[PDB]
């Protein structure tokens, strides 16, 4: 669960702090956090949906990292990034929605979806950050 | 020293081609008279199985160790491949020629074929018993006799043979999938391989030993090695501005004098007809081996610093020690960039820890200056995996490889700060040196290209998945040489000789193969070592040998420590099917071997109660029990170890029915008499006086009034009343017909060592070579 | 057999000097030791030259010159002998090895010295240092390992360490052999108007490495013998260190265990063969015999006088007048 | 037998060692010049690797002391002696990283000899005590007001 | 053997001014025996050091 959170403030504090112009330094502490994620992911497969009028889509991960190389972000840097974020966006949506429908009495509180039951896994915890929401 | 680790390296030929002759057996059948119940010899005589060499020990422990050696002998004789045309032999009888397998096989036949045996069915079989070839599939059918346990062996030897095929295509394929691809070079062969070819796959799995985690000590020794190895390659440069000429224009461009020194300390830097070649080589290897170097400079040799910037822009910094990048940068920052850029005020105060170069970034403003900082500072290595097989290579930022807009930028930034100032002169000497980098920049652009390629080339040839750690012996590099190489080049283009390259591959190869192999050799042993309970073959043993077989290392000159930790890691490793698959074999039957064969037994029972004796055909009726059903027991091994708890002492004293287990010395007696006198109740006495026992030679009674001159008793009528028989199975008999097996293998093989050689590797004309950018490397005239 | 020290001195150096060691040693001959006064012929005459350099000339122009083959110094071809006398001390002998030995030792020693040159432990070599610097250095224990440098016991370790540490490979190997031939060296020792020939299991001087290698060993020895090491130093037949009855005993017994004859003392002051520091003040001995020379060199009567006056001034300056 | 003992923990349960190490395994960080952490932690590791063995050490003593001890009649309260006994960390350090699969103990005969001595000694102390007392008391009812 | 791998690990001479006062470590083949003995007796004896 807490996992899930990060995945977002990651993107927001991302799709927001990352645009044609800014000087590296305001995101050094950010870029890092980001990459860390990508790694943990790549390789693992996910099952989202399978109930009612809900599309069942599969997701594979195999993406590059980031160019800590440049100084002041050049447009070209953004686009090659936004294209990688828009897979996580369209993803998370399909993730939230999936666990935003299942219910159970006994253990109603805990996670239920084949998507999230795999997130609470230990090998993922390496992601949490900025829990001020 | 120096060429002292290279001759130990070039001189490594693990490529031995293991093979065999003799079919590995252990038991030859033998004679022995037959004893029909009642104890008479009925003549004819039957054939049973006994072992060649009854070596077997005295004491369970010594036993287990014994077998162990078998494992080591098995591996050293471990048949790499096999062929039978080289195993021919002839049959005295048969529909014809007969050509069978292994002298022993032959003997046996002729033998039984004379000592009136079960008759027909035997002679018959031996007859229409031949060989025949199915030419088409290159198959071979050879007959042979062994023994269930023998077929067992030799069999797997056939179903395993580590010798894959060999076609043009495979040769082509073992030449790195990044060189055949590299344009600038050309392949070419002089022959066409036959369908008859084969090749030995030098296996090269990764550092199954993470020999960099804590073991630093050894990595340093490796790096070192891999490093010298590199220099042995790194092409010796070619034609570059005669030493004298350049250094002379050098004095000019600056304007010197009389006791008026300024830039004068920048040319104890000439000597490059030595320095450039060293600086060049040195740099590459460093990268390859991935070794970490130091830095010997001065603070009055500003020039030498400028060139540093050349360097730095390049190697991702993490490639140098910490205490060295620190010095260098601050030296630049404090005496090079502030002191003529009206930025002094604070000659920069520093206190160690954090990044003294870095901090200069978030410092002053100026764009040209500013890009350098980020590009150099946060410039690292790109951790790259696969390269046409798990290479685990470390590459230099695509950017830098010849697309050296870095150099051009490194210069533009230099062309622009030479504007403001502070201590009037000083700037004179300083900027004048800077310009010598600028003019030369046309050429400096080149140097980059060179290395770029070379490193980027040589690379592939390493199967030794190099990583990124801090060395310890630190190779030394002077800014002296650096500086030379710098302003002293151009118009020239040099590149890795073909023959050179291979040689490089080859070595790492072997080496790898050795590491991997010994690893397996190692593991196999240790694991066996455990499922053996040899709490007494202190392992400080195996490790030693291991490392040794990997020359370079001063075995004696390395502690017992690291060594153990070494075991700790090995213990958690699998075994190579080959290795493993054999041990399972040895154990599985182990019992059968031991129990059979004389010179020993297993254990003895002491029932203070008269009793019968089995009538087995081999011996007459004697003292044996293959089952020991009932009664208590007591491991001897765990006895002479435990110090005997007078437990035995008491039972013996009090006379209570009991048994014993383990390695034991049997003793055959005849003259019936001995039995009636109940002799066997003796021996056991001893013990009482001696806590420990080996002095225990148990009693047996081979009895058949036929050979036992004292038949007088078989006479009347009788049944053998003994007190205490013996645990020892019995040598199976010999059913020849089914005791034989059949064999398959191949015909006229053709093994090949090394390979490669088969190519006249040629090179393009230097003046127009290419890098990972399809551009003329070296175009500025 | 620390005597590791050899490696450091020659660790960093495919130095051109090591590669062309043969030319350098050949050139150095002018500053080379001495050999037997062989017989020679140049042009159409005969001479009795004793200088090692000329021997190279006769041998090169005679196909006899063969440096790759360093003459064995044993029973077959023993070692002649030279000597060095000094007031108040048992006479010491000097080998007389051929020229193959100097050649196979000049480059390595020269490279060794450069290391020494910048290492303070070797108070004799360090920079341009004069005896005053050495005096000032002494934040104490001094010794007189003169006898130890010739103790039959010393030769095995000394040679083993040098060999263990050991174009370049050719040079590295040849130097090693010098030690091996030495391991078993016979001496052409005279005994009247006759020239006897006994064995000799001790080390003597006559090799390039003598003065340099000797120090390595002496330094190695004190390190071994040595209840905070502020300074450690060597100087020919003396080695000291600034770190009393108990320590001295422990030190002497230690020197004793290694079966070595030595003068291990312990103190504000120290004495050694070159200089004695009594009372915090530096002193130098002043006993250079003026009217009795050690050996009959090749100087002339005039030069003999200029030499005598030189000797007189040194004495006046040191004390004796 | 007042013979101050010590943790079974220490004894052979050893772990303290394992913990003494694990705590060391996470001390590798900044603050001052580099020639520092480098040299420092490198040394530390030599304790770690050896830890497998350092274990053995604990066992050793554990036993030995725990053994020898037994044969001591002379009770032993803990006191602050007036004299030290110098111990150069020199040796300490050696013993440490310098012990392998070695394993030694008290020779039987050795042990007895030990008992025997303390024994006698004791007996003497006790005995003379009685010899002593007896006299003095007599000394008083005899009015031998003198010695 | 050990002290040699020690120098490899130790990085002996690295700037510091107080060298060779860490290696008085020697005579260990003994030191250990002394340190060992010494330690026990101390205990038993009920000594303090």
Curated annotation (Swiss-Prot), chain A:
Protein name listed in UniProt: Intermediate capsid protein VP6
Subcellular location per the Swiss-Prot or TrEMBL entry: Virion
Stated family: Belongs to the rotavirus VP6 family.
Organism the protein comes from: Rotavirus A (strain RVA/Cow/United States/NCDV-Lincoln/1969/G6P6[1]) (RV-A)
Domain of life: Viruses
Post-translational modification: The N-terminus is blocked. Sumoylated with SUMO1 and SUMO2. Sumoylation of viral proteins seems to have a positive role on viral replication.
Transmembrane segments: none
S-S bridge residues: none
Note: The VP6 trimer contains a zinc ion located at the center of the molecule. The zinc ion is not essential for either trimerization or transcription activity of the DLP. Zinc-depleted VP6 has an increased sensitivity to proteases.
From Swiss-Prot, chain C:
GO biological process: DNA-templated transcription; viral genome replication
Quaternary context: Interacts with VP3 (Potential). Interacts with VP2; this interaction activates VP1. Interacts with NSP5; this interaction is probably necessary for the formation of functional virus factories. Interacts with NSP2; this interaction is weak.
Coiled coil ranges: none
Subcellular locations according to the entry: Virion
GO molecular function list: nucleotide binding; RNA binding; RNA-directed RNA polymerase activity
Domain RdRp catalytic: from-to ranges: 133-282
Protein role: RNA-directed RNA polymerase that is involved in both transcription and genome replication. Together with VP3 capping enzyme, forms an enzyme complex positioned near the channels situated at each of the five-fold vertices of the core. Following infection, the outermost layer of the virus is lost, leaving a double-layered particle (DLP) made up of the core and VP6 shell. VP1 then catalyzes the transcription of fully conservative plus-strand genomic RNAs that are extruded through the DLP's channels into the cytoplasm where they function as mRNAs for translation of viral proteins.
Family: Belongs to the reoviridae RNA-directed RNA polymerase family.
Record's protein name: RNA-directed RNA polymerase
Cellular component GO terms, alphabetical: virion component
Part of the intact protein present: 364 to 726 of 1088
Key words, A-Z: Magnesium, Nucleotide-binding, Nucleotidyltransferase, RNA-binding, RNA-directed RNA polymerase, Transferase, Viral RNA replication, Virion
């Amino acid at each position: 669960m807490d996992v899930l959170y990060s995945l977002s403030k990651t993107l927001k504090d991302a799709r927001d702090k990352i645009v044609e112009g800014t000087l590296y330094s305001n995101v050094s502490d950010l870029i890092q956090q980001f990459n860390q994620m990508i790694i943990t992911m790549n390789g693992n497969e996910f099952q989202t949906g399978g109930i009612g009028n809900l599309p069942i889509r599969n997701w594979n991960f195999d993406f590059g990292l980031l160019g800590t190389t440049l100084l002041n972000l050049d447009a070209n840097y953004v686009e090659t990034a936004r294209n990688t974020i828009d897979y996580f966006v369209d993803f998370v949506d399909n993730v939230c929605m999936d666990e935003m429908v299942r219910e159970s009495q006994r253990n109603g509180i805990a996670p239920q979806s084949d998507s999230l039951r795999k997130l609470s896994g230990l090998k993922f915890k390496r992601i949490n950050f900025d829990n001020s929401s | 020293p120096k060429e002292s680790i290279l001759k130990k390296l070039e001189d490594i030929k693990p490529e031995q081609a293991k093979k065999q002759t003799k079919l590995f057996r252990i038991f030859e059948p033998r004679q022995l008279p037959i004893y029909r119940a009642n104890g008479e010899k009925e003549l004819r005589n039957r054939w049973y199985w006994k072992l060649k060499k009854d070596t077997l020990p005295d004491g369970d422990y010594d036993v287990r160790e014994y077998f162990l050696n078998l494992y080591d002998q098995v591996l050293t004789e471990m048949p790499d491949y096999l062929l039978l045309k080289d195993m021919a032999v002839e049959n005295k009888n048969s529909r014809d020629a007969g050509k069978v397998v292994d002298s022993e096989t032959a003997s046996i036949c002729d033998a039984i074929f004379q000592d009136e045996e079960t008759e027909g069915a035997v002679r018959r079989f031996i007859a229409e018993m031949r060989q025949r070839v199915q030419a088409d599939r290159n198959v071979v059918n050879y007959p042979s006799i062994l023994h269930p346990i023998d077929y067992a062996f030799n069999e797997y030897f056939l179903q395993h043979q580590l010798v894959e095929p060999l076609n043009n295509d495979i040769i082509f394929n073992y030449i790195p999938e990044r060189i055949r691809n590299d344009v600038n070079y050309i392949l070419n062969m002089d022959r066409n391989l036959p369908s008859t070819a084969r090749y030995i796959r030098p296996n090269l799995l990764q550092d199954r030993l993470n020999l960099h985690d804590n073991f630093e000590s050894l990595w340093d020794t490796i790096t070192t090695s891999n490093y010298i190895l590199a220099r042995s390659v790194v092409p010796d440069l070619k034609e570059l501005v005669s030493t004298e000429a350049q250094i002379q224009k050098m004095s000019q461009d600056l304007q010197l004098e009389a006791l008026t020194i300024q830039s004068e300390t920048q040319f104890l830097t000439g000597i490059n007809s030595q320095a450039a070649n060293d600086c060049f080589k040195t740099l590459i290897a460093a990268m390859l081996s991935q070794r970490t170097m130091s830095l010997d400079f001065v603070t009055t040799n500003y020039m030498s610093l400028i060139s540093g910037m050349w360097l730095l822009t390049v190697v991702p910094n993490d490639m140098f020690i910490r205490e060295s990048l620190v010095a260098c940068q601050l030296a630049i920052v404090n005496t090079i960039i502030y002191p003529a850029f009206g930025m002094q005020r604070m000659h920069y105060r520093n206190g160690d820890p954090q990044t003294p170069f870095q901090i200069a970034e978030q410092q002053i403003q100026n764009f040209q200056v500013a890009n350098w900082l980020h590009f150099v500072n946060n410039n690292q290595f790109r951790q790259v995996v696969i390269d046409g097989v798990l290479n685990q290579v470390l590459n230099d930022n695509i950017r830098n490889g010849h697309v050296i807009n870095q150099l051009m930028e490194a210069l533009m930034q230099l062309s622009r700060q030479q504007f403001p100032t502070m201590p009037v002169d000083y700037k004179r000497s300083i900027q004048r040196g800077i310009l010598l980098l600028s003019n030369r920049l046309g050429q400096l652009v080149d140097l980059t290209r060179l290395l770029a390629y070379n490193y980027e080339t040589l690379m592939a040839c390493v199967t030794m998945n190099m990583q990124h750690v801090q060395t310890l012996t630190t190779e030394k590099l002077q800014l002296t040489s650096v500086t030379s190489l710098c302003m002293l080049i151009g118009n020239a283009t040099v590149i890795p000789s073909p023959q050179t390259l291979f040689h490089y591959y080859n070595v790492n190869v072997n080496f790898h193969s050795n590491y991997n192999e010994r690893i397996n050799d190692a593991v196999a042993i240790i694991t066996a070592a455990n499922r053996l309970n040899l709490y007494q073959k202190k392992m400080k043993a195996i490790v030693e040998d291991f490392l040794k077989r990997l020359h370079i290392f001063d075995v004696a000159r390395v502690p017992d420590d690291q060594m153990y930790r070494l075991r700790d890691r090995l213990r958690l490793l699998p075994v190579e099917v080959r290795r493993l698959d054999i041990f399972n074999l040895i154990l599985m039957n182990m019992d059968q071997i031991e129990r059979a064969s004389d010179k020993i037994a297993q254990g003895v029972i002491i029932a203070y109660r008269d009793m019968q004796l089995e009538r087995d055909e081999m011996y007459g009726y004697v003292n044996i029990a293959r089952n020991l059903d009932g009664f208590q027991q007591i491991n001897l091994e765990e006895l002479m170890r435990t110090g005997d708890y007078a437990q035995i002492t008491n039972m013996l004293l009090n006379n209570q029915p009991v048994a014993l287990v383990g390695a034991l010395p049997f003793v055959t007696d005849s003259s019936v008499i001995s039995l009636i006198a109940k002799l066997d109740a003796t021996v056991f006495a001893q013990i009482v006086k001696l806590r420990k026992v080996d002095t225990l030679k148990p009693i047996l009674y081979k009895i058949n009034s036929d050979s036992n001159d004292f038949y007088l008793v078989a006479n009347y009528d009788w049944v053998p009343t003994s007190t205490t028989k013996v645990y020892k199975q019995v040598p199976q008999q010999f059913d020849f017909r089914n005791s034989m097996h059949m064999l398959t293998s191949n015909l006229t093989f053709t093994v090949y060592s090394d390979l490669l050689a088969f190519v006249s590797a040629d090179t393009v004309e230097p003046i127009n070579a290419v890098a990972f950018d399809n551009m003329r490397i070296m175009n500025e005239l | 057999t620390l005597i590791d020290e050899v490696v450091k001195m020659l660790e960093e150096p495919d130095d051109h000097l090591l590669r062309d060691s043969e030319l350098a040693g050949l050139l150095s001959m002018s500053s080379a030791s001495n050999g037997e006064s062989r017989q020679l012929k140049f042009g159409r005459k005969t001479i009795f030259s004793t200088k090692k350099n000329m021997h190279v000339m006769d041998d090169m122009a005679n196909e006899r010159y063969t440096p790759g083959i360093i003459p064995p110094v044993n029973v077959d071809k023993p070692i002649p002998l030279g000597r060095r006398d000094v007031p108040g001390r048992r006479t010491r002998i000097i080998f007389i090895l051929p020229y193959e030995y100097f050649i196979a030792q000049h480059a390595v020693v020269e490279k060794m010295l450069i290391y020494a040159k910048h290492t303070r432990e070797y108070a004799e070599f360090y920079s341009q240092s004069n005896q005053l610097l050495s005096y000032g250095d002494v934040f104490v224990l001094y010794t007189d390992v003169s006898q130890w440098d010739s103790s039959q016991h010393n030769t095995q370790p000394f040679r083993k360490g040098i060999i263990m540490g050991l174009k370049v490979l050719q040079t590295l190997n040849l130097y090693k052999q010098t030690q091996i031939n030495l391991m078993d060296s016979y001496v052409q020792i005279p005994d009247g108007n006759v020239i006897k020939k006994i064995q000799y299991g001790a080390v003597a001087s006559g090799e390039k490495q003598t003065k340099a290698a000797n120090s390595i060993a002496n330094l190695a020895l004190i390190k071994t013998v040595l209840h905070a090491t502020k300074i450690i130093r060597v100087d020919g037949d003396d080695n000291y260190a600034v770190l009393i009855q108990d320590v001295s005993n422990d030190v002497r017994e230690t020197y004793a265990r290694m079966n070595a004859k030595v003068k291990a003392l312990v103190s504000v002051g120290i004495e050694i063969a070159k200089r004695y520091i009594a009372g915090g003040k530096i002193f130098f001995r002043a006993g250079i015999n003026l009217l009795n020379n050690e050996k009959r060199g090749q100087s002339t009567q005039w030069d003999q006088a200029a030499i005598l006056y030189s000797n007189y001034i040194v004495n006046r300056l040191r004390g004796f007048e």
